[PDB]
Every structure is written in C-alpha cells, then in structure tokens.
Amino acid sequence: MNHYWGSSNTIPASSTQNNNYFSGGGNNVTIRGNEIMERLPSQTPSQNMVQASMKTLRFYRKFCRLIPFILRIHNIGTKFTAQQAMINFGNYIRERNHYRDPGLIDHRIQLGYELLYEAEMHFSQHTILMQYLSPYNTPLSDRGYSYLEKVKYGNKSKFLQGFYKGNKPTEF
Amino acid sequence: KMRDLGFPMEGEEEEYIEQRVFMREQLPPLESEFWKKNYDPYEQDLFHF
Amino acid sequence: VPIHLRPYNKEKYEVPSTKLKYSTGYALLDVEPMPRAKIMKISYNILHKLKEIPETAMYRIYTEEKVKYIMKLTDEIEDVRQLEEEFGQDSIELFIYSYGKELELVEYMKHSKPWESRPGDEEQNEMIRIASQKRVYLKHQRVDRPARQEAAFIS
Amino acid sequence: RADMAHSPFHKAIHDLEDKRSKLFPDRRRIPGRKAKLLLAASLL
Amino acid sequence: GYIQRSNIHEEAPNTSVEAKHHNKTFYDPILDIDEDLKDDIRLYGRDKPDELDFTDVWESSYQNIICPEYFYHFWFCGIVYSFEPEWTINYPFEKGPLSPLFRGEHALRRYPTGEERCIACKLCQSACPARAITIETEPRPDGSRRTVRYDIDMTKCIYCGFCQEACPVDAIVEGPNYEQTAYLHEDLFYDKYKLLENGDKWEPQIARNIEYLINQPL
Amino acid sequence: MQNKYMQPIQLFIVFEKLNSKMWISKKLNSNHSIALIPSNWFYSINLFLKRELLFSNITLIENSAIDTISYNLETNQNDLDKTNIENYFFKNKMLVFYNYYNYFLKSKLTLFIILNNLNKSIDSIDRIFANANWLERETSEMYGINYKWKIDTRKLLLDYSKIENPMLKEFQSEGTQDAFYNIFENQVVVLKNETVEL
Amino acid sequence: EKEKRSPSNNIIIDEISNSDKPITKENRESVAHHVRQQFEFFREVNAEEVWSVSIEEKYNPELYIYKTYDMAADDPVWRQVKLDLEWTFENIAERRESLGYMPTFKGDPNFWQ
Amino acid sequence: DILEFSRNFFTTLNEMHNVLTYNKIWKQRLINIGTYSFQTCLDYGLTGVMARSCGLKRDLRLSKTETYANYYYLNFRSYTGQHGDCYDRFLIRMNEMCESLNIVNQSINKISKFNNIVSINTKKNI
Amino acid sequence: SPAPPTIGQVELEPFKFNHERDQLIYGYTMEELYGKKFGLKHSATVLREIK
Ligand code: SF4
Numbered sequence A: 001m002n003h004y005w006g007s008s009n010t011i012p013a014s015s016t017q018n019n020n021y022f023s024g025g026g027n028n029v030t031i032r033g034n035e036i037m038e039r040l041p042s043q044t045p046s047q048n049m050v051q052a053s054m055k056t057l058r059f060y061r062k063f064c065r066l067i068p069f070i071l072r073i074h075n076i077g078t079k080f081t082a083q084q085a086m087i088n089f090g091n092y093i094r095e096r097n098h099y100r101d102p103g104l105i106d107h108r109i110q111l112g113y114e115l116l117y118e119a120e121m122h123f124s125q126h127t128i129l130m131q132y133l134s135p136y137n138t139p140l141s142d143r144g145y146s147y148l149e150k151v152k153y154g155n156k157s158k159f160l161q162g163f164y165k166g167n168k169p170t171e172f
Numbered sequence B: 001k002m003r004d005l006g007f008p009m010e011g012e013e014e015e016y017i018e019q020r021v022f023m024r025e026q027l028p029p030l031e032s033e034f035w036k037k038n039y040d041p042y043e044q045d046l047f048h049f
Numbered sequence C: 001v002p003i004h005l006r007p008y009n010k011e012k013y014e015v016p017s018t019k020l021k022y023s024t025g026y027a028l029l030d031v032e033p034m035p036r037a038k039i040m041k042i043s044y045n046i047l048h049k050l051k052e053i054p055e056t057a058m059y060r061i062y063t064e065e066k067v068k069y070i071m072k073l074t075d076e077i078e079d080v081r082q083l084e085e086e087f088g089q090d091s092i093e094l095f096i097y098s099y100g101k102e103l104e105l106v107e108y109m110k111h112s113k114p115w116e117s118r119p120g121d122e123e124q125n126e127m128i129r130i131a132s133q134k135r136v137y138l139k140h141q142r143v144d145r146p147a148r149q150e151a152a153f154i155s
Numbered sequence D: 001r002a003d004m005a006h007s008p009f010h011k012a013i014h015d016l017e018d019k020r021s022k023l024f025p026d027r028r029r030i031p032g033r034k035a036k037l038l039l040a041a042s043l044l
Numbered sequence E: 001g002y003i004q005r006s007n008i009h010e011e012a013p014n015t016s017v018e019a020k021h022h023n024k025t026f027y028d029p030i031l032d033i034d035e036d037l038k039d040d041i042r043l044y045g046r047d048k049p050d051e052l053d054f055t056d057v058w059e060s061s062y063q064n065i066i067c068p069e070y071f072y073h074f075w076f077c078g079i080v081y082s083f084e085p086e087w088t089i090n091y092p093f094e095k096g097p098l099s100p101l102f103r104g105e106h107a108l109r110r111y112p113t114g115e116e117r118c119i120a121c122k123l124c125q126s127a128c129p130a131r132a133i134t135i136e137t138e139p140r141p142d143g144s145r146r147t148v149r150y151d152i153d154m155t156k157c158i159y160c161g162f163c164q165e166a167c168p169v170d171a172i173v174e175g176p177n178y179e180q181t182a183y184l185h186e187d188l189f190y191d192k193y194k195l196l197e198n199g200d201k202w203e204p205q206i207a208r209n210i211e212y213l214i215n216q217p218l
Numbered sequence F: 001m002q003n004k005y006m007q008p009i010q011l012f013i014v015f016e017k018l019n020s021k022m023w024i025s026k027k028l029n030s031n032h033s034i035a036l037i038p039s040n041w042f043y044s045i046n047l048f049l050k051r052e053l054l055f056s057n058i059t060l061i062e063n064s065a066i067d068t069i070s071y072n073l074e075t076n077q078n079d080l081d082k083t084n085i086e087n088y089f090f091k092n093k094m095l096v097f098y099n100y101y102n103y104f105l106k107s108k109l110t111l112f113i114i115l116n117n118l119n120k121s122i123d124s125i126d127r128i129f130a131n132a133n134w135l136e137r138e139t140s141e142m143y144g145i146n147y148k149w150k151i152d153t154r155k156l157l158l159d160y161s162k163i164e165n166p167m168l169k170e171f172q173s174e175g176t177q178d179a180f181y182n183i184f185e186n187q188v189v190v191l192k193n194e195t196v197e198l
Numbered sequence G: 001e002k003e004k005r006s007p008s009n010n011i012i013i014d015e016i017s018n019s020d021k022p023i024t025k026e027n028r029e030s031v032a033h034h035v036r037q038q039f040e041f042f043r044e045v046n047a048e049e050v051w052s053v054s055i056e057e058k059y060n061p062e063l064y065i066y067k068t069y070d071m072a073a074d075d076p077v078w079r080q081v082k083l084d085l086e087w088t089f090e091n092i093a094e095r096r097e098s099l100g101y102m103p104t105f106k107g108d109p110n111f112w113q
Numbered sequence H: 001d002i003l004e005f006s007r008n009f010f011t012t013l014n015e016m017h018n019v020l021t022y023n024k025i026w027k028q029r030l031i032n033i034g035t036y037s038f039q040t041c042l043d044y045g046l047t048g049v050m051a052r053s054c055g056l057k058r059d060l061r062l063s064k065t066e067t068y069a070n071y072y073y074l075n076f077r078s079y080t081g082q083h084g085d086c087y088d089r090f091l092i093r094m095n096e097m098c099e100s101l102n103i104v105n106q107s108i109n110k111i112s113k114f115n116n117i118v119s120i121n122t123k124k125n126i
Numbered sequence I: 001s002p003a004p005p006t007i008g009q010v011e012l013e014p015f016k017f018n019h020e021r022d023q024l025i026y027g028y029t030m031e032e033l034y035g036k037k038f039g040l041k042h043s044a045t046v047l048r049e050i051k
C-alpha cells in the first residue's frame, strides 16, 4: 500500500531482517512509520451521518492508539496519564457532537489526522499540543494547585463568583 | 517489460532514465470513480463461512 | 471517396522528406522524419475510437469535423514548411504531440458523458437566474407622514 | 535598430580601428595546439 | 495594442557603403566565426555528430590528462584579481555616499521664530502604513491648535517617508541620522520631547537638504 | 481590439448541457476571456481542457477564492446593469476562480465557480494540473474550502496545532492568540491576546 | 416578436463578437464553420506576433556561442554598446573641459528668514 | 553615472565569467542536472528563466497583447536553452544581465539630445 | 469500416531511444531520413594549420 499507513511502512527489526527469520512483521500502529508522509489524500465523501460517525470513531481510535507514544516522546507523561488524555480529547469530541453536515465532518477528520501526524513527528511543541489533552475542570498532575476561590466562594453561584471577580482591569 | 514500457536500454541513454521513469505524470482518474456508491476497503464475504 | 472514409495509404504518406529542420526549438523534442503519416495514423485512430461515442453527441460531431479539417489540410499539402506555416507557424512536433494527447480524450469523455444532463443542473440554473435582477435600495424610497393614529375606547 | 549593423541609433560609427584592436583579442583559438604541444613536451 | 501596424516586419538598416551611417569594422572576421560552430549538432540536443574526429580526441585528451582547470582558473583569478585595489570603506572614519533624500531618524521642526510647525492636522497619522504615529490634540491656552501627544513607535515604523510627504507644513521629517541603535526596547518609544530635541539638534543639515529639495522644482 | 481575438466557445459546444456566460473587459488584457462555470462540471471541463487540441498546450496560472457574503458596492450604486459580472457577487456564499494561459491560442482564460453550499465542497483538479496542489491547499486553508479527491489536504502556510480560516471577512487581522515564552514551563505557549489599537 | 431572435437562435446576447451565426445542435454545418473559423484564428493570431512566433527563426536559428574570455567579444552588438559608452564618456569629458568651470548649488541661510 | 556603471559592469561580469563558465568542476556540477522538458514546464506552471530554459519562447515584455512600459518599442534579444538544465539557466541569467545593460543604454539614448546647432558657414557647432 | 493503422504505445513520445528509432527506420537509414549531422566545419586555413 503506497501510503504512510501502509502495512509495509514499518521500521525493520534489524539491519538484515524486517522481523525474525521465517516470517515478517513490524509496528506501524502504536508508533510512527519508517518513511515520511509525502501526501495525505482527501477523505472519501460521506453521504450520510453514519459514515461520518464511523470516520470520527476510527480517528478517535487511532488517536487513542497513538497516545502513549506521544506522551513518551514529548515528556508530558507526568501532567496526565494516557487514559486522562484520551478522556480529555473525548471531551473535545463530545463538545463537537452537535455537528450534522457530513462534508464538514470529513473536513474536520482531515484536520484531526493532520494534527495527529504533526504531534507524532515532533513538528509541534509539547506546550502547544498539550492544549488538546489538558483537563477542562481539573488541575494538571505535574504541579500544585490553589483552592482559594473554592473556599471563599463555597456555596455561591456562578454569577456571584463572576461578580466578585471582575471582567476588566480596575486601574483604568 | 522495461523495453515495452520505454526504459533506456543502453549505457548512454541511462543519463535520461528519469525522463522515462519519473517525469511522466500519472493519468487522472475517471469521474465514474468519484460517482461510486460505497468506498469501503474490499473484504471477503463470509456468508457461507 | 472522401479521405476519412478512404483506407489508410501507407505508400502515399510514408515517404522520406528532403527538407527537414536541423532541430526543433525545444529540449527533449525530436524531429519527426515522416509527420504527415503520423498525422493520418492518429486521425484514423481518433475516428475509430470515436466510433463508440453516441453519434448525436456534440463531442463526436465537433471532433469529427476538426479531424476531417486536419486530414484534408495535411493531404492537400506535401511540403512540411507550408504545413507548419499553417497550424500556428511553430514546430509540427508540438502539433503532433498535442494531437496524440487528443487521442486519450475519447476514453476520458466516455465516463464523463458531456451529452448527458446531471442532477445538479437545476439548482445551478436557478441561482444563475436569481443573481441578475433589479436591485433597489431601502433609502431613496418615498415615505410619507402617516395619518393621526385615532384612539380606540372600550365600552 | 540598435541591435543590427549600420543602425543610426549607434553612435561610435567612424574609424575606431585602433580602439577595436586594443579592446578585443586579435587571434583565434585553434583546436589541438595546446594538447599536442603539452603531450609531446611531457613525454620528452 | 492600441494602434495599427500595417507592416510588422522591422527591416534591417541600409547596408550600402554609400549610406551615411555605414559602420565599418562592425563585423570582425577573427572574432565573428559563428559560421564555423553553428552547424554543430551538440548545441541542439543530446545527439552526436555523424563522424567524430581527432580534433575531438585531442580536446578530450587535453581536458582529461592535463586538467587545465587547476592552472587556468587559479592563476587567472588569484594573481590578476588580487592586483586590483581594495573597495573597503573605513566605517568609523569614512561614510558611505548618501543623498539629501535619505530617510533616517524622525524629527519635529520649528519655524525660525521657534514656534512649532506642526498644527495637529493628523494627516501624518492616517498616512502611516504601519500605524506607528499616535496624536492627541488640545487647544493651547493662547488659542493655537497643538498636539498634547505626538509619539511614534520606531519598532513599528518602516521608514517609508509617507508621513513627511503628507505633512503640509514640513513639520515631521526623516533626518540624515542612522546611528540610533538602542539597548532597551523602551528607548525606541519616541515621544514629543525626543522628536523635538532631534529637530533642535539636526536642524542645520535638514534645513540645507530641504532647501535644495525645494529649489529643485523652482 | 487592434488584435485578433476569438471567444473560447468550443468549450460550451462540447458541453452541450451548460449555459454560456462570458465577459471581456478593457481592465484586463485584450486576450483575456472570463467565463462562468457550474461546480458539478468542473472536473470534466478540466479533463477536456487538459487533452483537447488547441487546449492541451495550457498551463494553470492562478487559483483563489472570494468571500462575497459581505460584498457591497460603495459608490455609483445606480450604474449597475444585469450584464455586470459583479452582479453575480450578491447573495452568493463563496466564489472560486481559476486562471489559465494557452500557448497555441495565446489566450488567458479565467473560470468562475459559485459555491452556494454551507460546507463549501468542490472537486479538486490537482490530479489534472500539478499546479493545483499547493494553490488549492492554500485556498482551502485560507477560506475553509473543502476540496474532494485531492492529492494532499494538509495545511500549507498556517501554524501547527491550529484550525482557522484567516481570510474570511469575519476574521479580524489580529487573530485570537499570541505566542509568548513561559518561564514556568521553559517553552513557548499560546495565550489569548490583548492588542494595541490606533 | 417578444424576443429579437428566432426560436432556433441560442445567442441571447453577443456584445463581444456581434455574431449572426448561432452554433446549434441541429445545424451540423455550423460546427464545421466554427472549426474553420477557429483554425483560421489560430493561424492569424500566431501570424501577428512580432517576437513570440517566427518560422524563419525555426528554420534559420541564430545562436550565441561562448568562445573567449570576453562575453561581449562573442557578439558584435555588445562590442558596439561598449564603444558607444566610451564615445559618450569622451564627449562628456571634452564638453566639460571646454567650459573650464562647473556651477554648483551653495547653501544660503537667508533663505530661512 | 548609470552609463559609467554599465561600462564597468561589463568588466565585472567578465570577471565572474572566466571562473565559472569553462570550469570543468562547474560543468560537471551543473550540466544534465534537473533536466526537464516543456511538458513538465507546462504542468508545473514554470515561467521566466526556467520556461526559457525548457525551450518555450515566453517573454511578457515582447508579447503584443501583454507588453508594458516602453518595452514593445525597443530592440533587445531574449535567450532560450536547448537542454533544460542548470547550465542553461546560468548562461541565460548572464545573457539577460547583458541585455538589461543594452536596454538601459537604449532608454538613456531615447531621453538624450544628440544633434546640436551648427554655424551656417563652416559647419561648426555652436 | 477499414481497420485503423496500429500506433505503438512508446510511439507518440516527444523523443526516441535507439531501438525506438530502429523501429521507425526499418526500411531506411539515418542519412536518408533525418539528413547529415556535422560536428565541426573548419575553414581551409584552420585545417591547414591543424595538419
Ligand atoms: S502631518 Fe504634519 S501638521 Fe499634520 S498632525 Fe502630523 S506633524 Fe502635524
């Protein structure tokens, strides 16, 4: 398969062997490929919501399979575990659940594959790509956190918390 | 097969090998390929299995 | 008998020429010793390939007319220099290359069917029709002072 | 015509034989002279 | 294009010796020997001539064995090109050639009486392609309209001179100074004090240059 | 005018099911012809162009898109007729234009396509013209165009780990993020931006 | 009567060419006429360029060949250009030496009263 | 001063000429490198020096319908290669520099006043 | 309808190799079809000097 994900795009086990003798093999799913990606063709158009949902599920599965490799190569394993990163990106996808245009979904899947490939080949910076794996309402695991506003504004509603803390600087 | 394709068959002509192996563009696909109904990868039908 | 309905004459066209250019003006383009024979061959092959397109389609009619024109012109001319003076006053090699390119369009047009309509034509025509119309503006419109709003009283 | 001989646009038209001789080479290279000379000299 | 041309062929000039503009020695038999070399097939493609010759044999033997590229280029570059005098301009002690139009450091000018030329018309602010000029205006207690703020971000400026062209009283100018290198980013935030002192320091040269430029149309 | 000109009318002769709308203007070169093309025939039309005689010696010069959802005449609003090409910029969500040059006919040909679907989907021609790869990639990333049957759909000029279409009219030229160095992380991060205004 | 054209005329409007011969599917001779016209236009548009197209150049090419240390010496036009430059310099030098002086612009602070 | 620059630019261009053009290393580094024909030259939208190297005669200044700014009414040459490689592009660039010098000279001549007033007797300039 | 003449697949290419040319010129030679190719045409003086 003349593609970056092809079954023959694996790194050889040794300099004289693709795998052990008597057989062949290689890992192309949980790690990056041997040759670099040179083209990423368009997603085949989806005629209904079922195909788009299948595309989303398969993209999420590929992302989940690639999480541990990304965490290891980017040195971000202490901020969150693999499962936490999967859950955060699933929260992202859930926030994108209301989509109902299959062409828009194909475009989004193309963009997601592109960003995943950028992450897995050290094109992007870890402090930049971590914005998609970060928790929504929880502190990161690599540092301490402040619970001051939890104690002072204990039972107060969201409106009161946003009223006591302004929305603009006060010097001017 | 190479001679039928048009590859160089002499030492002197090999200097232009690329002109016969890379510089020729691939033919564009027919529009019937775009007008297909399903685009799933092929697999064996296991009805009787 | 018309030339396009006349069997290909190997002896008439495959004749050496004593007046050929030293070279073409293009890199990796070789002078063709017998260009008229090649033109006749490509024209006949084009007609045979068109034999599969529906006869009522304008693609077939247009291509057949152009091929007939080219065949008549190249048959009536025996000197390559005047033939090259026709067809854009350039190297005949470019013309032959482009005509060989013309060969494949017959296969490419079978699966595209320019003679058959498509489901999306109606929306395109509607949006074409909508675009061109008189476009007045809200200002420059006459507004008069409304009459007094008479008050209504309940019983 | 400024790019062909005897053009009125050209200015230096009078006798410039001395300047033309001084500014440009006066001998034509002939193939094989250096090759034959150098090879024979090297062998000897 | 927009005119007619009955004859598109530009005929060659008259070649007769009787003609007034006859140019002898235009064609040199020693130099113009292109008829010798024009029939070579090597100049038209990848093809080879019908017959090779011992002249080509000798040329190849000379090129491959003697290797003239190590003595031709070496001598002809090294010795001769090193004989030429140097081109260096001693920067601390000499300056490169400029012009009175040179666009350098911005300055605000004054009338010969000491009055500010700038009347806060804000044409220079809208003329700036980089949006580097900020102006605020209040009526001065004597009644004249003057800026209470006129500042230029020199890190935004592209040194294009659109502002000095837009000024209708020649208030803002680009001076001849280019040695304005700063150690802090805040040293390049030019306020009215800086531009005014730049004008008060560089006034003679700016006046001379502007005098010449004004006299040019006259 | 003062030169030999002919319309590219054979294109609509072969494609018998298409309306023909062509323009010539003195604001363009005297050999430049502009035509309107429906979106559902673009791939077949390019297939015909690439191979048909007196069209085969053609090259793709330029490709881009126009966001006409905010197109308004600012002056001379009463000097518009039904034949003006700008009359097709109204009520139309998106426009796409391609510009080619033909060496045999020595002609410039511009083709305009009206996109009226919200997802902005159109077939790609980078399998026919090798120019269209980078051009279409840049157009797709700038204007959100969804190209189908494209060789490469990756971003061309935009930054990593970002999804945006900066050339839409809704987008402000200052963007939404800024890049700063973070001491607490010893690496560059992106933050919501506060910018100066003139 | 409502439209200005016959029902068999497909030319809604033609300002570019003002053509009176519509191309129609029914009339096959119109296709032949259009083909003849387009080939004639091909020949004529390629027969009007002053530099791009030249059959005489195709049959009698003129080449530039590098043969000496001087790039200009391989072409008479460049030699003529160099001689013209020297001629202009000599004329300027003699014309300026004849006068004996050179007027100059001298600054005047009286300009700034 | 522009004419002075042109006269000395001839010499500087010859100086660059004699270390590169006939150099064996330069020829072995540039000849038959990156060779392409007109078909690629059309597929990838190549224009300018690259298009003149692929063999195509395409100059916007010399085009009848596409010329601009006095170019159509001058007299200069343009150069096309016959191999479509790096050597052709190098030679074309050098020759284009020379022709640019020629065009500048022609323009200066077009804004020049050559003839003068001569005395009725003795044909002496005044 | 008469059968059209056959066109080779490698035919219609812009340029030809040695065996392709051999296919094309089966009845003739290079000189009879293409003409004569000349390397260099030295003048009488140059030839005399070379000898
Ligand atoms: S352009 Fe001149 S006059 Fe106007 S606000 Fe600026 S400095 Fe003042």
Ligand code: SF4
Pocket (backbone or CB within 6 Å): E127, E128, E129, E130, E131, E132, E133, E152, E156, E157, E158, E159, E160, E161, E162, E163, E164
């Ligand atoms: S020189 Fe140009 S960019 Fe700089 S302040 Fe003036 S107008 Fe703005």
